[PDB]
Hints:
Chain A is an alpha+beta fold. The first copy, chain A, has three domains: 1-65, Double Stranded RNA Binding Domain (2-Layer Sandwich); 66-191, Rossmann fold, CATH 3.40.50; 192-347, no CATH class. Chain A is built from nine helices and 21 strands. In chain A, the strands form seven sheets. In chain A, strands 4, 9, 10, 11, 14 and 15 form a six-stranded mixed β-sheet that branches. In chain A, strands 1-2-3 form a three-stranded antiparallel β-sheet. In chain A, a hairpin with a 2-residue loop joins strand 1 and strand 2. Chains in contact: A-B, A-C, A-D, A-E, B-C, B-D, C-E, D-E. At the C-E interface, helix 1, strand 1 and helix 2 of C face helix 1, strand 1 and helix 2 of E. The structure holds 5-chloro-6-(1-(2-iminopyrrolidinyl) methyl) uracil (5 copies). The site of one 5-chloro-6-(1-(2-iminopyrrolidinyl) methyl) uracil has 7 residues of chain D, from strand 18.
Amino acid sequence: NMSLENVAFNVVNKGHFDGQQGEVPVSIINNTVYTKVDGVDVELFENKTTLPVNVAFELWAKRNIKPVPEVKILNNLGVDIAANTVIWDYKRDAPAHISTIGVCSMTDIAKKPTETICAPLTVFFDGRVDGQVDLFRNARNGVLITEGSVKGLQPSVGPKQASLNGVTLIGEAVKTQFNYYKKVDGVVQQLPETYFTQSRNLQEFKPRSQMEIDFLELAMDEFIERYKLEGYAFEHIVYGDFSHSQLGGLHLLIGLAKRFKESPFELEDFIPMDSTVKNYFITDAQTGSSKCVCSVIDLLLDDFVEIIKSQDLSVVSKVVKVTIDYTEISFMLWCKDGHVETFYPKL
Amino acid sequence: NMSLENVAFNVVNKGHFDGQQGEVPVSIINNTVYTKVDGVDVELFENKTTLPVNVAFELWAKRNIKPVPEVKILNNLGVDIAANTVIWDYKRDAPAHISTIGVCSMTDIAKKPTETICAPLTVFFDGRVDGQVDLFRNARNGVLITEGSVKGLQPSVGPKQASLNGVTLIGEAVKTQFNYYKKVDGVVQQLPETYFTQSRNLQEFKPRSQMEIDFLELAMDEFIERYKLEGYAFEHIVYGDFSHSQLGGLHLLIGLAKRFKESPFELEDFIPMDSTVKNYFITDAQTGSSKCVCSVIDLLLDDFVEIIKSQDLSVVSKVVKVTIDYTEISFMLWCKDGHVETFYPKLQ
Amino acid sequence: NMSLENVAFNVVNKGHFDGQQGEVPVSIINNTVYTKVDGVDVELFENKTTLPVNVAFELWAKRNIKPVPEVKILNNLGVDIAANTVIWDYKRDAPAHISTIGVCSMTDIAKKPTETICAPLTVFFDGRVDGQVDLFRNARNGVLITEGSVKGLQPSVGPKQASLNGVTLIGEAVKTQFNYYKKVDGVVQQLPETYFTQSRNLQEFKPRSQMEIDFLELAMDEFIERYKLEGYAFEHIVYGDFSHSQLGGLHLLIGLAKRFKESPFELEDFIPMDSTVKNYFITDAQTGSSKCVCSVIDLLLDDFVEIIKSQDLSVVSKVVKVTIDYTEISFMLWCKDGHVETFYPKLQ
Amino acid sequence: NMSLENVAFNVVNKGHFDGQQGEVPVSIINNTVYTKVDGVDVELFENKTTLPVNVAFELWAKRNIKPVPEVKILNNLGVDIAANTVIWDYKRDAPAHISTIGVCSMTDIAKKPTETICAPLTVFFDGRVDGQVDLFRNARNGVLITEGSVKGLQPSVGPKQASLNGVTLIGEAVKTQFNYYKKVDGVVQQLPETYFTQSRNLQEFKPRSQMEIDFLELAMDEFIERYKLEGYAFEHIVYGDFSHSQLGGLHLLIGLAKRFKESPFELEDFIPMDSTVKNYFITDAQTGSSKCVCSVIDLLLDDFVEIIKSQDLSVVSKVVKVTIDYTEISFMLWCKDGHVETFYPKL
Amino acid sequence: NMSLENVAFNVVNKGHFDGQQGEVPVSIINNTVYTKVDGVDVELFENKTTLPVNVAFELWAKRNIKPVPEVKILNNLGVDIAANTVIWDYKRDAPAHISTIGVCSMTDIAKKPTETICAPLTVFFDGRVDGQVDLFRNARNGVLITEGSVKGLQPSVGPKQASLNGVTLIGEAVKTQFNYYKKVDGVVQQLPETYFTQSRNLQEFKPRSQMEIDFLELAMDEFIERYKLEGYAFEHIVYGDFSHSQLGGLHLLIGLAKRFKESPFELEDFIPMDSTVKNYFITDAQTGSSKCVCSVIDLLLDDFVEIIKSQDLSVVSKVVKVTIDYTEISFMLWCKDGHVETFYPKL
Lengths: 347, 348, 348, 347, 347
Ligand SMILES: N=C1CCCN1Cc1[nH]c(=O)[nH]c(=O)c1Cl
Ligand SMILES: N=C1CCCN1Cc1[nH]c(=O)[nH]c(=O)c1Cl
Ligand SMILES: N=C1CCCN1Cc1[nH]c(=O)[nH]c(=O)c1Cl
Ligand SMILES: N=C1CCCN1Cc1[nH]c(=O)[nH]c(=O)c1Cl
Ligand SMILES: N=C1CCCN1Cc1[nH]c(=O)[nH]c(=O)c1Cl
């Protein structure tokens, strides 16, 4: 007996869809779902998706409320759809995937991931749910996460962090670090050695290494001396140059975090979605320096330092490919006279 | 077991809400309800009401599909709400009443009309439904229809016609003539003697008496001579006067029907609802004669002739009250030198 | 060169998308596309689909404007998608298929039907378009139409009529009768022997055989006597029975057409889409007889007579399967004492 | 001469409806009201209600701008409608009541509360307005507030705080503490002895007693010792247990306030309205501990301590009824071996 | 080849319209523009204007991304339309002007400002763009800004600050101080001597003079003594009186800034647009003092002091006209017994 009113009953009484029996009266208007509480309408859901309001409400109510991979990792691994769950994209306020399997009669393409319509799609499987490892083994295309080993399968250790109800966190009361596995055309695929981004944000930025503490604490000249970074344009690249009309550099989140603590600036997130590299239109409030496309990545500073120090500085211009979050990120490296001028990731 | 998806399943499978178990997939968008059929979306309902789309859909699916009184009758009798049904108002594409009793959880004020919230409201009861005559007997305020006698209650014979799925008709395979009863503050009321409007339409107009046949077939002059109508301004009032820029008269539907057969015109229904008197902005296409507010009533011609021949004609202008469809309709009567100049109903 | 403004320029200047260069100014508001003509806004398209307004506009502009199979045929043959065209579904005012191939960047799953995403889907190919017969020969799943012979493939002769810009017609200046071919999992299929529905409408109903002429012109009794139809309940099944509150029979479009000429009625099309069997909520205006779900099919009368005269009549009720428009339509047959009581299609 | 344009004139020139004469040009679009200022459109009102945009605009413009009872108190006392004013619900951005009396021609069921249509409804009367005490005396059902005594009527002293333009506050320049009176079916009703919630919020939380200062300042072991709370599971109940997957306890707002100062967490207010007990879907950012339905109440800590210490701890499971904000709040008390395990309010 | 899809291509790849060739797939729904990124819809623009969604999107994408005059200055100078650019109004989230010249085929009234349809309109010209000074000279009505002298034209030195992507700032990496020129009916007009407002906001308020530092730092009695302000009701006017039901005074932004640091209050901006004088409905959270129409201006405190000390205090009531932001601001001055009672600007 699945229905709009039963989904709303579950949201009101359980905080999300929990399979309970019951109904509440519902009103739909203004792309919004209301329920009646003691004679007046209370908003339960405002649709920000491109789906019909009542369909989006049901997928949101049926969202996975356990730690799940961040959407950027699923996208980077080519995931098209999830087995018997909904990965909600809190950056977009919308389902991460267009279709479902065994979730919702308006969006399901199948009830089980073994149906043949699913074979060409990369299905996400969650080894914490009974039966899903076996489904991964039978699927032609898929991505599997587990908490532990799967007999005979070679794992890839994922990022330390995961998303729990739209909060990205490294779990202490719950496990957020998974093994990853991937199959293409029926064949298990070796996932590449990879760096991971750290998923921090500008204002709550906390360092995760002694080098990152030093960078936030020392003066730039002091930090550069200790970590032997002369000639790598580290200031320009990480900390930014605000002296000209066009803002120079500023491509690591920790550098924006330091600048923001000192002096606020505006960041227009003009493609608002989860991605390994983010592009912002930045305007510095104190100087008026700005840049329409400022590419930013949150790598652990030690990782970025390892990457840039590995580069040959003998060419004026060069694409540098780095595996990050399982995907190939192209960096542009600009050099002159054997030292770096700039280095930035591309989206 | 109440559910949007179950309402849609009933619409798809039974043509209306029939209390069947089942569900179909539904999308709501654009103030429209869709359902998915073989991979594509099919429209089931477009909301034209001021209620939320899913609520309006459910009240529409739960509409009464038996012959029921036209909305103008229920309005004139002061009905506020219906016992355990929805009277769908097809002139407004909306429920006839704001609230419900035992129909829909978003709009219900009660499950049964015996709840005290219902005592002040004038509840419509339907003697065809078991138990509702007795519910009327116990109610403080109500209107009751029946198909036959009720012990101890004198009936008022209602109109011949009723509304069945939005079609107004005089039933032959089904009964459409009801007895009417009304209670106010626990007291059974004597309903007044009344004329009834005939609820016909311009394009499909059927005469219902020999006088109406003669009016449609004879020339104006011969008709007036036959029924001895000199001095009552029938040429103005019923036939209409298209000779000046302001259209004169034309206040009886049969007169519009006769003109429309001969020469088409535009009628703008600028207050689109069911009422005993209708006002139209009329533009005649042949002549260009027009009138912003042309008040029109569909009386049997014989009834209209009885009314106008039953008036005193000795003052320039006055209000004439006529009980029609159970309500008091004001007409304006204008006379000169002992004869009619014009006579028209007012929408009020 | 793809662009909303370029799509609008083609609509304004060519009547549909024709691949021409140019642009006009466009406004989108109210799920409606406008363009500016001499300082004011003119409506080009009102979106009635569940797709975004600008996407629906483009698919509509890119609709196939040649005669194409009616949507019910394509549905019954299991077509999922069309190769490099849009079949516009004029009954739903929406694309017949959710996705496209080589039409529109928002809806395309592929540029060409040879991409592997297309292999499981049943792709509609059009032999009038160069290369598409060969694309069918190579496709895993498909339906092909042609105007003539294909070397090595046995044809199924399709219906006489097809849809041209939403008008269903039997072409005289253009060919509307196609050969049909179908492949499932790489294997060419033998399509079954089938009847076809005639796709006529109530108001414009044209007889297509002498038997149908006789049915429209003769009285019920003389018709039944002439074609020796006693015992098959044609009076109930085809002519309909309006004598009780529940309307009896009336399951053949020609019978509705004959009634409609004599006396109008209301048909509520409560699942508005193209299908072989249609269900209507019918209310007869003259009698008040009505039925919530009246199943109606437009067969040539001769075909219907062949079907009903080809059944065993010895049990109270059973399901009779009939191949119509390439699909298996279930009918319910009800008999008593060796004669028909009623016979009606089911929408399923 | 009441009209949409006159309501907008009043909003522009007086900040709200003030009965002044005048008109401004208005545009309605996107469920929003605009007025034209020097050639361009300026937003005056965005409709978040289920009423028609122009109707909601007029009720919002006609909102009571004096301190009024919080909506949760009116709801708890059964109020259906207000006499000749609009109580605006700033938690819902909507009128607290569906219908009006003498306010708005689209929503009025009557012009005066003495009309018989009002008799079955509990009408709110404001004794600060001339004539309303007398109307309360003539009404069959109603709730009256006053600043002072009403001859012969037995008062109930209300909460110290009230709402002024959506700000909940204890007045110093204005009076916010009212006497309350209530009638049902023509009969004055004795209002119960009651606790009141304190209406504080998470981030601006300020303590209102020495015990509350101590709780924010001392360590939990120290606080528990001083106030002799051993065996009442006070830590679990008030301060929360974040060590497991499912978040244990945490049912008093002061405990969330303390936790939030230390380490931020997300609170999804999935039924957004004013109520004595609130239910949140909480996710702790530092540990990943979470709970779909966490029931929370803001009682003065001294009040909560009085309540829990009053309980008999000899039964494993027991509903405990406490009058709060004039309504019966059911608490679940769970005990083992003569000490409390948990204690939480229900919504 | 201008089109909706090309505008969206530019927004995605360049951060704004940059004249680049290319297209992305776009969806329009819910008065919102989406583009498809790897199979799912991402929001690019939410229309808050009264224009059609796709038209508003194009004007926003084509917004001037250099420092431009704040909208209040353009409005005060009578500007109706801009030459070959879009001044975006970030206070209204909408174009500052209804029509355009050479920007957008749905809103253009002309392609060049020399067309005769433009003659009756005051056109904004930007002397930093090649050719626009000459266009100003040929225009019948217009306003011109430049960075430097224009031969033979008498300049007016504008405000120090300008708006860069909705951030108001005094430029250090870019120039924000312009010369202003204005023509009416073909004749160059002498712009008046004027004060300028400072365009600061409540929470980030930073002082810009020793007097402003003193006001934030000293006690009111101390500040008043040092700057010899006795008898000018400075406390009432600047700092506010919260002791009564109706909030007295509080008309300078610096006074609200000081009060807000000490104790928060609500400011309802009920006409949300950019203007020299702003009107707020204010409610003090600590006392409950409030005022429906509180007129506020951000003048440098030294400027306000110069203005009030210049006034003759011998009349109970008097309108005082002050040129601010090039416009005539009327102040009401109320005096008794030779000292000020209050002084407030009018909107
Ligand atoms: N600074 C400029 C001006 C245009 C090119 N560019 C470099 C740059 N920087 C980024 O941050 N991201 C890019 O993609 C690119 Cl590309
Ligand atoms: N013809 C005119 C011009 C204005 C008055 N009038 C009569 C009239 N005729 C109607 O039909 N209805 C009215 O209400 C009225 Cl009133
Ligand atoms: N007349 C009635 C009343 C309910 C059953 N029935 C027969 C019928 N007739 C149709 O036309 N179509 C049906 O599906 C069915 Cl079923
Ligand atoms: N902790 C759990 C898991 C399910 C039951 N429960 C207790 C609880 N806690 C609340 O905070 N509120 C409740 O209503 C209830 Cl019930
Ligand atoms: N304090 C009051 C009560 C009504 C008049 N007034 C003064 C005032 N103060 C402002 O701040 N702005 C005004 O426009 C005006 Cl006017």
